[PDB]
Amino acid sequence: TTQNVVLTKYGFDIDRATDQIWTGDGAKPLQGVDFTIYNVTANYWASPKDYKGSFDSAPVAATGTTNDKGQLTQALPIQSKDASGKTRAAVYLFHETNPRAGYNTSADFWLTLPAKAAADGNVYVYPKNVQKTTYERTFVKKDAETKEVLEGAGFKISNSDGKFLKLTDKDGQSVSIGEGFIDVLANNYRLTWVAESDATVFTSDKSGKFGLNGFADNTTTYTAVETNVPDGYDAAANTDFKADNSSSDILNAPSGILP
């Protein structure tokens, strides 16, 4: 016999009971968060009063990923064996292995089954993920003579170590990135640092804007390098910046033609 444990992951800027079906009251549900569920029955029952969440050498009961609604369901046996081979009430520990971008991981928590279930026979848990402050930056490419904005200019970004920015999805895979401001938070991307040739190219949109959010801090200096220059212009100088939530303009001078 098993119970269903429904994990629901909401983000925050109370311990809710397992019998409570809580909608988050407007807080956003967090999709794409990975969990491993360890069967820690042997570890708890080796000495209950001493248990403090070790999953050392504990078998894995389950894995998965929160969905569009922040949810992850699993059917878990209400009983399982202890180290001495004796049947006990099962204990399961939840371990977040991959948070959502912009969020701290949640604390490992655990519970005994069978647990107190809500009206629908399910046991509801609600790990707290606290939002960590991240920073962003926008740039607006313009024509240095006309001061009009400029579409189609391509840029890469480098750090203090000479490594360039590549965005990936939650699992580290390549993604294809288009023009404009890139919402890393909403797409659950990651910032990685690689060789120039593997870098992600950012590109001014029809309003000249490009950039991203999802920076870890606002103290590191980064550099925007123009790598694709619109025809008829001269490269702007490299632009040092901080991820400080500001917008600033980058000027392309129209190249001069003499007779």
Residue numbers in the entry: 39 to 51, 57 to 302
Sentences from the study reporting this entry:
Here, a protein band (~30 kDa) representing WT and D295N-mutated GG-SpaA was seen to be present throughout the 24 hours of trypsinization, although trace amounts of a smaller ~16 kDa-sized band began to be detected following 3 hours of incubation, with the levels then continuing to increase over time. The results suggest that the resistance to proteolysis apparently displayed by the WT and D295N can be correlated more with isopeptide bond in C-domain than that in the N-domain of GG-SpaA. Here, a first and second Tm for both the WT and D295N proteins was observed at around 52 and 66 °C, respectively.
As with other Gram-positive bacteria, sortase-dependent piliation in L. rhamnosus GG (called SpaCBA) is assembled from the ~30 kDa SpaA (backbone), ~20 kDa SpaB (basal), and ~90 kDa SpaC (tip-located) pilins. Our findings show that the GG-SpaA structure has certain features in common with other pathogen-derived pilin-proteins, such as the Ig-like CnaB-type folds and the presence of internal isopeptide bonds6940.
